[PDB]
Each structure stands twice: as C-alpha cells, then as structure tokens.
Copies of this chain bind each other. A is one copy, B any other.
Amino acid sequence: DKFTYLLLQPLTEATLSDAVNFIVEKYSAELPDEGDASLVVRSQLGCQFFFLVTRTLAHDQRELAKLVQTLIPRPVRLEVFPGLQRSVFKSSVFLGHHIIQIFMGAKKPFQDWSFVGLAQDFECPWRRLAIAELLKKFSVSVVEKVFDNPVALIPQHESDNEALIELVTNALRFALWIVEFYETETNEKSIKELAFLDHSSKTLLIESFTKFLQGKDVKDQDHLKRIIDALEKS
C-alpha cells in the first residue's frame, strides 16, 4: 500500500527518492541470503530500479534518471549495475533519453555526444556492451511485470499504457541498434534489422538527426549521416 501509492504519484525528486529507498530496503532483505531463491527475488527488485529509470526517460526528466544510481547503496549498486555498466550508466541514460524523446516526438534538443562522453563510450567495444546491457534492462523492465500490482509507465496514463510501452520499447530497440551496429550501419545485415521501425519513426529519426548534426563535431556528424543513410535505405 505504501509502495503502490508512491509509484502512482506524479514523478518528482521526492517521490523518486522514497521509492528507491523502499526497493533498497526490500533489496537489502535478500543480501544476507545467497541461495537461488534470493537471486530471482533480487533480480526482480533490480529491474524495479530500471522501471523507475525508464519512467524518468519517457517523462523527459533525465536529471531524475541519473539520480537513481546515486540513491542506490554501493553493495546493491555492484549487483544492479555490474562491472562496466556502472561506468557507462550516465551515457546509457542520455542515449535512451535522446531516442525515446525523439520517438515521443519531443521537438529536440539534446546535448553533444562528444561532450557527455557518449561518443567516447562508442569507440570502446566493451563500453558498448555495458551500454547495450543497460538499454536491454530498460526495455524489459517495462515489458515484464516487475511489481506484484500493475503500474502505468507514466502516471495517470492508463488507457494509453500499452501504446506508450510499445513506443518506448521500440525507441530502446533503435538505441540498441545504434550500439550494436557502430561503424557498420550501412551494411546490408545492419539495415535488415531496421525492418521493425515504422515508416513515420524513420522519418522522425532522419529529421531529428539531420537537425542534430548542425555545427557538431565532424566525428559525431559522420556518425549521424551513417545512421541517417542507413535509415534512408531501409
């Protein structure tokens, strides 16, 4: 009751901090145990965190998204954000936010890729894996039922919840495509995996990127038109 109240509230820094504290109190409750029953319970509580992250991304409150990793205790943080996921979470959040907002139509803009260290994380193949692992976790937290009671991805938006999740998960999939096909975008096999995208989605992406490359670093620009050209061919 105390929990379901919070999750249903409008998304603020207050409602976010209290919720994470509750999950952690619940998450902690499994750390003394080390069996298999403990791991599955912990694994669900873990993606309850990512639900809250995915909510913030889809609600255009990215500053709240970064705050999630802060409210999480270090031992819990080591298990929820394993290894290199910890180091690239800042970049993953930005990447997921950028794409999701585009898919929701948000008339731009988004910070540089070479400034927020996102373009840097791309050039490391092991950082792309840790980013991809996070994007995947973002996606599954809103597809699966992480709570024992149904919760809308965006508060108050019940009747359109199935539509929102569909939209968000597609965005999180295209963000996953950018990662896995870095510098191999225009290759035939890479383009075949753009078949999932709606035709309107591609146009929204082509436009938002074409408008996003203006004045940017050449490296980011060439990265973008590799993406755009891959969109224009699918």
Residues of A within 8 A of B (CB): 36, 39-40, 42-44, 46-47, 79, 82-84, 86-87, 124-127, 129-130, 132-133, 136-137, 140, 144-145, 166, 189, 192-193, 195-196
Contact = CB atoms under 8 A, between A and B. Distances in A.
25 contacts: A39-B83, A39-B84, A39-B86, A39-B87, A40-B84, A40-B126, A42-B83, A43-B126, A43-B129, A44-B126, A47-B126, A47-B129, A82-B83, A129-B136, A129-B140, A132-B136, A133-B133, A133-B136, A166-B189, A189-B196, A192-B195, A193-B195, A193-B196, A195-B195, A195-B196
Contacts of A125: 140, 144-145
Query: Which label, helix, strand, loop or mixed, suits the secondary structure of the A interface?
Result: helix
Nearest to A43: B126
B189 A83 contact: no
Contacts of A130: 43
Contacts of A44: 126
